[PDB]
Write a structure and sequence with these properties.
Chain B: InterPro entries: L3_arc_euk, Ribosomal_L3_dom_3_arc_sf, Ribosomal_uL3, Ribosomal_uL3_CS, Transl_B-barrel_sf. This is part of a larger assembly, with chains A, B and C. By secondary structure, chain B is mainly β. Helix content of chain B is 10%, strand content 29%. In chain B, the strands form four sheets. In chain B, strands 1, 6, 7, 8, 9, 10 and 11 form a seven-stranded antiparallel sheet that branches. Chain C contains two helices and nine strands; from the N terminus they run βββββββββαα. Chain C is globular, with a radius of gyration of 14 Å. The chains are: A alpha+beta, B mainly beta, C mainly beta. β3 of chain A pairs parallel with β8 of chain C, so a sheet runs across the interface. Chain B binds five RNA strands through β2, β7, α1, β10 and β13.
RNA sequence: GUUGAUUGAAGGGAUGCGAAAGUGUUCUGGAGGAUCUAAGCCGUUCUGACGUGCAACUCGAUGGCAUGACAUGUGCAUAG
RNA sequence: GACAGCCGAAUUGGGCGGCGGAGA
RNA sequence: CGCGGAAGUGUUUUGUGCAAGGGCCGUAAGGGAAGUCGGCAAGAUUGAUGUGUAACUUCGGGAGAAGGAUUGGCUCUAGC
RNA sequence: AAAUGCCUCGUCAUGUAAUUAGUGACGCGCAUGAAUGGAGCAACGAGAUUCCCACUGUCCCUACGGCCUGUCUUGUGAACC
RNA sequence: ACGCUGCUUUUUGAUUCUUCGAUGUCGGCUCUUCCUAUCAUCGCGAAGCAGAGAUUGCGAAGUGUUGGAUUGUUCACCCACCAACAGGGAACGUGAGCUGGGUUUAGACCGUCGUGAGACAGGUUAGUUUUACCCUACUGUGUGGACUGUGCAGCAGAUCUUGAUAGUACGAGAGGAACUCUUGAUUGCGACCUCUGGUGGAGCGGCGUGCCUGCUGGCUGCUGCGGAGCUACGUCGGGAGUAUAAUGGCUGAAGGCCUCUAAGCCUGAAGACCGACUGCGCGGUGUGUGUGGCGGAAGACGACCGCUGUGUGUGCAAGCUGUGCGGAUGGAGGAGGAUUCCGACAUUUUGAGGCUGUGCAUU
């Protein structure tokens, strides 16, 4: 069973392992780990991470 | 004097004194109540703890109650249970001082793992069998058998020295209990012949050890404020002037963990064999019952296993005793399992079935 | 007459006494402060604390001069602390927000800004009908 | 015996306004028991350490003062 | 032919002296 | 000065590996003084260069008021 | 109602959800008051007080980690009572 | 009402029996235990008890009784929540447990009093908190097998709520319940690490200061991610046993009637006892222990759990980091005849290099 796809890295997330974050516009982005939420906070572009 | 602001006391006096256990295989304190209008069966078993995992489950409510079907994710424990061997019979009669044990019947050939437990590792340096069978039939208010485990089938323990116990036999007609166990000496009995799915069970074992611990951890008392001289991890007042002695109900520092505990009402979820594919799930893949990489600090499960809901006392590779319920049980809700997780428990595993990892990278 | 509060599964609590929350309806207020939680029974030294769905007793720190210097009721709708759902997933919002209420349970405003959790929407159906998004 | 900086008084130059009386702007110069920092000197708080001590008054962090109504070696004068 | 509610034999009001029980 | 290096000078070669509790320190979800006699303790601000600076006032001050912005490496241009 | 007011947590206003605190105003002031100096705060203060922003393990409620001690060895080997 | 009789030892007095070759003197914070004259929760009476909401009484001490503003305060007084926010004792419990705000010798200011030195239970500000390594008590630990019996000691869960019952019984109306079933939680207790969060002087990367002549590679400083293990802010888990109290009843005299009582009997509580659960001594039995060494799931040291050569090393699996050196092709521009040199950084070879205490195999 899959929970969803990571919105930063593009990889499948297993059932029970992500955190949904809802924004003020009603948009709920799904991320896998703190390695990924940090790259979003610093405003890095995912295309510069191989 | 009279103390404004009352609060509950910290910890329970049911379990004081808090000493180490004197044994790694505690014996059960009671056995269920015999109903002699049933067939003959056993009331317990011994297994070994392996590790924990997931499961997703469908909460059957599909009537038009406002919530038809929910999903529920539950944690489980796996125990590895090879079959046991019977090698003896025991009877107890009733006297004015209680239960008196009668002489014992041994089978024909006692194994080499039962002789190391009885006489140590250096132990290698008839009609009287028939007369003792008559006593357990005339006398003997209740009957028990002597069973032993086979730890050499799980080569990650390294034992060769078996655990042995006495288990009560339930089912009526004391002469029927005896003849059922005479046709079972020296043979094996498997865990699927004792427990069944969706039943409540008891466990008995020893907890994880922690050594000598301070009083903030052993009992849960408050820390002192930051300005305090002579340390902050402690209790401030240990008594009144009178009585001019310290009481047994005061919190002190000492041994924490490695205690004997009995837990009750654990629900059985699955019963299978490790050397085949787990199924009854609603997904297609094969998936044996063991994660990618293996159970951490444990090998693989290759014999029979049993799966129960929730936490289970003790450490990995330690022996546990399983007992049938002593209470009254109602039904048990209908159980529908549809997924069992088998990712890696080392790190954050994201694949099931290593062939699925192999097809992601290509090469 | 007491307000009935429907059942709700266990959640981690994120709001405590002294937290400043944001007002999410067009009633005139801007900032609220929590001074109490309903249904709190107590424990020595433990502060009363709330999760989304709970009713709080608030004081208006910023807004219309009519509403100030009194005690009000409010429902909590968002929090920034993570909580777990029973299907196994986790979720969080971006701010802490609440909405003002009568002594019988009716909203004071007519509009509500932002999204709302699915838990809050079944306990309080009149809030469901005025929310722009549910999760 | 006393390091490196900060601020910019009087005096002096140039330039603009105005009938006059007068006044704007900006350079130069280097005053004051004027502001920090160093060699160093004290002793605010932690009611910190220590409290048969390293020690019959010390140790750590934090803070105050550092051109003086200063600090310090040595000759002389003042005695119950 | 009482007392009690035709029946057939005892019924009852005040006190005193020991004993026991509430108040505790 | 602090943070690092020379010169000169001083120095040993078969104790253990780390329970509780101490002395001196480091990192913490969500909340943000609800703690306490008392923000005690800790955290926070910090160099330089443009910008922008109020009440009051002994007209000297207040003033570095407050508040906002910029800062690395590389390759060149302009002034004396 | 001041480092000076017994009665006293004086009375009214203002800051708080809630003010024996703070500030403003009132005055028959147990016992204010003029070099016994009175009124008065620009500049200066490791002086005494109350509030605001910022900030945080002060606290809700504690967790995990570092070095030196303690725990264990050999040598030297006291005191209070 | 007017009068009269008691009990307690929580007030403040009255007294001066003990201690002046010294018993640390207020409050708070922390922690344990006891009392009942019961505030709530369980059972049950009365009514000027229709229902709802309260008022008054009896059995009952098992479990609970909170968070803040002002004051050093005890005390007091308000705000918010609550099933409810009862009252007391333990050297006015508790300073080799802390703190030191009150009180608080030696500095100082004000008011009143005194010729003065000085005085004031009048106000204000600044003012050292020493020592256990002894005996006992208490907490663990040790005091030499395996399987069990049975005595003693300890003892745990408590309380609220959603829907239905039902707009029903009751009531002129307005209003407005209960038994039984059912949903979730708060707090206490005992465990556990699959998930999520915290930590992580293990490991990999980035950016610097000094030093090894520069590049490569090192050492030193700051920083991002961060497995295992530990942990909570995360996950799991509760008898329908026996006899009774208050009260209400059955049969029934004394006393031809009456009566729950004098003989007997039925019912009945968050209470009692027992069970289950944890610890210790003593018994029994076809039953008596690996000197040493090495490991761990165990551990301060002793002990406990295992084996009796199956380690170490290496490979694979499963993870963490994030695209290695060298080469080749480029690069804002600058220098100048060679078509040369200087240059941060870019793309490619390359999910690439480095690392691992976990699992499997082999040597």
């Amino acid at each position: 069973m899959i929970q969803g796809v990571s919105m930063f890295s593009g990889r499948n997330i297993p059932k029970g392992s992500g955190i949904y974050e809802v924004m003020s516009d009603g948009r709920a982005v799904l991320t896998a780990s703190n390695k990924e939420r940090r790259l979003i906070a610093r405003k890095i572009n995912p295309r510069d991470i191989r | 004097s009279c103390r404004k602001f009352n609060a509950p006391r910290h910890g329970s006096l049911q379990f004081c004194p808090r000493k180490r256990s004197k044994t790694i295989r505690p014996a059960a304190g009671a056995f269920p109540a015999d109903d002699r209008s049933q067939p003959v069966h056993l009331t317990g078993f011994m297994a070994y703890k392996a590790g924990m995992t997931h499961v997703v489950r469908t909460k059957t409510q599909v009537a038009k109650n406002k919530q038809l079907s929910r999903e529920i994710m539950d944690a489980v424990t796996v125990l590895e249970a090879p079959p046991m061997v019977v090698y003896g019979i025991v009877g107890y009669e009733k006297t004015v001082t209680g239960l008196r044990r009668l002489p014992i019947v041994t089978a024909a050939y006692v194994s080499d793992g039962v002789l190391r437990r009885m006489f140590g590792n250096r132990y290698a340096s008839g009609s009287v069998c028939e007369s003792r069978v008559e006593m357990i039939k005339e006398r003997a208010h209740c009957v028990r058998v002597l069973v032993q485990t086979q730890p050499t089938l799980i080569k990650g323990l390294g034992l060769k020295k078996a655990h042995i116990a006495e288990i009560q036999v339930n089912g009526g007609s004391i002469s029927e209990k005896v003849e059922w166990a005479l046709g079972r000496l020296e043979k094996e009995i498997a865990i699927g012949e004792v427990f069944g799915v969706n039943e409540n069970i008891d466990t008995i074992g020893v907890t994880k050890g922690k050594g000598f611990q301070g009083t903030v951890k052993r009992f849960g008392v408050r820390k002192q404020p930051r300005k305090s001289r002579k340390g902050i991890r402690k209790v401030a007042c240990i008594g009144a002037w009178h009585p001019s002695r310290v009481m047994y109900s005061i919190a002190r520092a000492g041994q924490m963990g490695f205690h004997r505990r009995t837990e009750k009402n654990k629900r059985v979820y699955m019963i299978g064999n490790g050397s085949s594919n787990i199924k009854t799930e609603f997904d297609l893949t094969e998936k044996p019952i063991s994660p990618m990489g293996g159970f951490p600090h444990y090998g693989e499960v290759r014999n029979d296993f049993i799966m129960v809901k929730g936490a289970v006392v003790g450490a990995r590779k330690r022996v546990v005793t399983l007992r049938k319920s002593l209470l009254r049980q109602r039904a048990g809700e209908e159980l529908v399992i549809k997924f069992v997780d088998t990712s890696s428990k080392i790190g954050h595993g994201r694949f099931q079935t290593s062939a699925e990892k192999k097809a992601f990278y290509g090469a | 007459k007491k307000i009935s509060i429907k059942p709700r599964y266990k959640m981690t609590r994120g709001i405590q006494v002294e937290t400043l929350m944001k007002c999410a309806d067009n009633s005139g207020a801007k900032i609220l402060r929590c001074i109490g939680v309903k249904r709190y029974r107590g424990r020595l030294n433990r502060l009363p604390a709330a999760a989304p769905g709970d009713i709080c007793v608030v004081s208006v720190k910023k807004g219309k001069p009519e509403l100030r210097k009194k005690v009000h009721y409010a429902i909590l709708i968002r929090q920034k602390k993570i909580w777990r759902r029973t299907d196994g997933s986790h979720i969080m919002f971006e701010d802490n927000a609440a909405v003002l209420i009568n002594n019988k349970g009716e909203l004071r405003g007519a509009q509500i800004a932002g999204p709302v959790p699915r838990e809050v929407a079944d306990m309080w159906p009149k809030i469901s009908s005025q929310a722009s998004s549910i999760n």
